[PDB]
Structure 1
Amino acid sequence: TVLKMTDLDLQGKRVLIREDLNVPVKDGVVTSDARILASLPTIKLALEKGAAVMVCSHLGRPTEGEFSAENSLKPVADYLSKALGREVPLVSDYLNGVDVKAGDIVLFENVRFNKGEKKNADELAKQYAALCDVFVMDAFGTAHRAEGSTHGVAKFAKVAAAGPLLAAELDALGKALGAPAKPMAAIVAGSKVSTKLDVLNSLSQICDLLIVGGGIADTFLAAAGHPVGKSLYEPDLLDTARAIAAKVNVPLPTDVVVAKEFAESAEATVKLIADVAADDMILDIGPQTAEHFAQLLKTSKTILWNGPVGVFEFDQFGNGTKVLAKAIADSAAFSIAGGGDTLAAIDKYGVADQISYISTGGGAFLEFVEGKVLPAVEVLESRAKA
């Protein structure tokens, strides 16, 4: 367990909150604010509880030690000022002290500018901790990496707790991965079985139904001796795919959508899996497979969604993902989705409000599903003991 910011007395205390404000910026303007909107309840709560609030976050991947204006959090300070109806200053020099009174809030400049951030140097971690009475970790999307603002500061802060956003992510994930409501289905897609091997292996013992898509589905199709044509699969992993399919039910596609090239004179063709030619590219599941997979998902009590089942950004290759998105949305299951590709499909087909939990954790989301120890959560558990 971890301490919760909601349960702490923050009246007059200096609270340092690590948020995930790594948002798209163009010419000094935030262009999509979903991550800031998600963090605003935490910030407003901290102020409501009477704290002197310091918000910190990363942005992009600048070179450590050198200031780069394109990686500055100044556009987020502009956004936060408009969002809170009050000035939110960007403090660019803070590791040797920062002046913040109770009721006020500042935004630290990009933590990735600070030397020692990526390698979690003790000296920088103690500088963060010296600036606050409480440290709050509220950035799940960075919880899988030990960095000065995500891990080290929690070793040295007088009090270290999880924010309500991080606590919400951990609640939803534990609901789907710790004794989930059966039957559980998972959808896993990607270009390579090898790159998602631990994800597949972990889910293979958790779920009752494993739907695969993309290049992963190619390797499983070829592992059953089916022709995939000009579609990437990994010959050194068909044995692994066979082992996975022996441990969990992996239904294979009945039909697929193929095309010989991306061109104006390129017809998308539905073919049965035995009828795929050497120069065919499998780019979606067929309408029969999409309907059958939808019927399998409809009675699930838990659904873990990690990937579309076709190159859905093309409408001619997006039917399989569209049908599955509606199937998940229509189902009464507890639905949890993660991965940038999955969230992109959720936006395109408009099912966000019908998904039980939408994780923005990306790589950290996957590593949690793999069963790996997330260091930012591990250090918080160390600070939650009597």
Structure 2
Amino acid sequence: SLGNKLSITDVKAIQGKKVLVRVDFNVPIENGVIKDTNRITATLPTIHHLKKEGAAKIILISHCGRPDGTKNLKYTLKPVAETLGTLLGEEVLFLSDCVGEEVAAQINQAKDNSVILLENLRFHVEEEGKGVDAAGNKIKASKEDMEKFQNELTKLGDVFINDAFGTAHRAHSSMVGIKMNVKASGFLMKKELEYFSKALENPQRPLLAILGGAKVSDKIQLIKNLLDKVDKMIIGGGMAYTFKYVLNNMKIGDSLFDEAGSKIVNEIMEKAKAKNVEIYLPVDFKVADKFDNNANTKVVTDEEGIEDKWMGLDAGPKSIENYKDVILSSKTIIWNGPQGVFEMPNFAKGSIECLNLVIEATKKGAISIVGGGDTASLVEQQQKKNEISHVSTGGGASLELLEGKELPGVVALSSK
């Protein structure tokens, strides 16, 4: 289950507690300078709630870069402490390790209600459970080494807050081994779990999935899992040409064709029929004579097909018209994939109209979830993030959740 997990707002006893918080501070650092501070800024509601609720210590644990289970000061969290300090308007204490008597002593010695940032968890092989030494030899932590490191992290505090949903798909020490009585989601994780629970457990129906992207192959698990939940599915973008070719023997010219993925199209269509899911493929396309925004373009229907040396780069006007009744009658929308080459303004119309319809449905009461990646970029470029119920930032974890995979970091949270 996803919706019955304990959240930071449900925690009653916070005053005078040492609160251990797993955050996502995997920020790009260019010679001591943080170039993107969004991940740091996104943890402020969690930190503010803990300070306001009178926490004795706010102990932050995270990772960044790729140290591979070895101390590697290129991936030091030291600059993150400085940036977080500036954002908080107070000094954030940075510690050179994350476990042990010395770290414990420094935490206890710190000013009450203050914020402490511990060094990168991934400097320890026990965090990921595997790594690589300096020489390049593979190293692995034994069950006992793992258990000892997990016990050491547990000894740092009294209450555990997991605000790192983007790492919850991993059975890492900081996701599964912090054995405190209260293990609650932080505000970021709370929102992710709340909205993914709304979309996938007992959703408000009709439930619609809007899928797109360049390939079929990397979306098979996602499609097959969503066919067990949804009532309707729009399949668009580059992946649609593979479907039109296999299903209707439609000429696709130089459009994208997924050779491995083409062999699974019939299975997908057969599962959709078994599950009584309505599939909506494009019936027309905006084609181009070159892969370029300034290409010569025209509209072809799926009855005409695409001529040799031409390529489909967006859904056509009829396919765009067909979205309207599908999207506007939907009460829950999971959107994972653009409907064309949105990076080229002349082939963004299908994706932009899909966005306008999803927004319209949301204003009228639908719950809209944007999976991430390219769809999130489109919503961001169009400046419409606040018009969508939830734009997930969980990356790989959001994708695994939608593929029906186990999230160990979620499983390890307390139940409400």
| Fold agreement, TM-score > 0.5 | yes
Which residue of structure 1 lines up, in the alignment, with residue 65 of structure 2?
Answer: 60
Given the alignment, which residue of 161, 169, 180 partners 1:136? 161
Given the alignment, which residue of 157, 166, 169 partners 2:189? 166
Shift of 1:107: 1.2
Long gaps (5+) in structure 1: none
Q: Residue 311 and residue 73 in structure 1: after superposition, are their counterparts in 2 closer, same or farther (change >3 A)?
A: farther
Structure 2 letter corresponding to 1:369: L
CA deviation map 1:298-334 (0-9, x unaligned): 2211111111111211112211111111111121211
Tell me the distance in 2 between the aligned counterparts of 1:283 and 1:145: 36
Long gaps (5+) in structure 2: 130-140
Answer whether contact 1:223 1:241 (CA < 8 A) is retained. no
What SS does the corresponding residue of 2:43 show, helix, strand or coil? Answer: helix
Q: How does 1:1-386 map to 2 (within 5 A)?
A: 1-6=4-9, 7-51=11-55, 52-69=57-74, 71-96=75-100, 97-98=103-104, 99-100=106-107, 101=110, 102-119=112-129, 121-153=146-178, 156-225=179-248, 226-230=250-254, 231-233=256-258, 234-246=261-273, 247=275, 248-263=277-292, 266-273=295-302, 274-331=304-361, 332=364, 333-381=366-414, 384=415
Q: Residue 27 and residue 286 in structure 1: after superposition, are their counterparts in 2 closer, same or farther (change >3 A)?
A: farther
What SS does the corresponding residue of 2:278 show, helix, strand or coil? Answer: coil
Structure 2 letter corresponding to 1:293: Y
Structure 2 letter corresponding to 1:167: K
Structure 2 letter corresponding to 1:85: G
Superposed CA RMSD in Å reads: 2.1
Tell me the distance in 2 between the aligned counterparts of 1:211 and 1:107: 45
Q: Residue 131 and residue 172 in structure 1: after superposition, are their counterparts in 2 closer, same or farther (change >3 A)?
A: same
Tell me the distance in 2 between the aligned counterparts of 1:335 and 1:376: 24
Answer whether contact 2:60 2:115 (CA < 8 A) is retained. yes
Shift of 1:65: 0.3
CA deviation map 1:121-142 (0-9, x unaligned): 2222122111112221111111
CA deviation map 1:131-183 (0-9, x unaligned): 11222111111111111112222xx3354222232222111111111121122
Tell me the distance in 2 between the aligned counterparts of 1:379 and 1:130: 17
CA deviation map 1:175-214 (0-9, x unaligned): 1111211222111123333322222122223222201123
Seq. identity, %: 38
Structure 1 letter corresponding to 2:252: V
Tell me the distance in 2 between the aligned counterparts of 1:362 and 1:105: 27
Shift of 1:245: 4.1
Tell me the distance in 2 between the aligned counterparts of 1:19 and 1:135: 11
Between Structure 1 and Structure 2, how many residues are aligned?
380
Answer whether contact 2:222 2:402 (CA < 8 A) is retained. yes
Tell me the distance in 2 between the aligned counterparts of 1:212 and 1:87: 50
Answer whether contact 1:336 1:357 (CA < 8 A) is retained. yes
Shift of 1:270: 2.6
What SS does the corresponding residue of 1:116 show, helix, strand or coil? Answer: helix
Answer whether contact 1:189 1:212 (CA < 8 A) is retained. yes
Q: Residue 238 and residue 82 in structure 1: after superposition, are their counterparts in 2 closer, same or farther (change >3 A)?
A: same
Shift of 1:265: 6.6
Structure 1 letter corresponding to 2:391: I
Shift of 1:264: 7.9
What SS does the corresponding residue of 1:270 show, helix, strand or coil? Answer: strand
Q: Residue 266 and residue 164 in structure 1: after superposition, are their counterparts in 2 closer, same or farther (change >3 A)?
A: closer
Tell me the distance in 1 between the aligned counterparts of 2:293 and 2:38: 36
Tell me the distance in 2 between the aligned counterparts of 1:130 and 1:204: 44
Tell me the distance in 2 between the aligned counterparts of 1:110 and 1:271: 54
Shift of 1:223: 3.0
CA deviation map 1:20-56 (0-9, x unaligned): 2223333433333332222110111112222201112
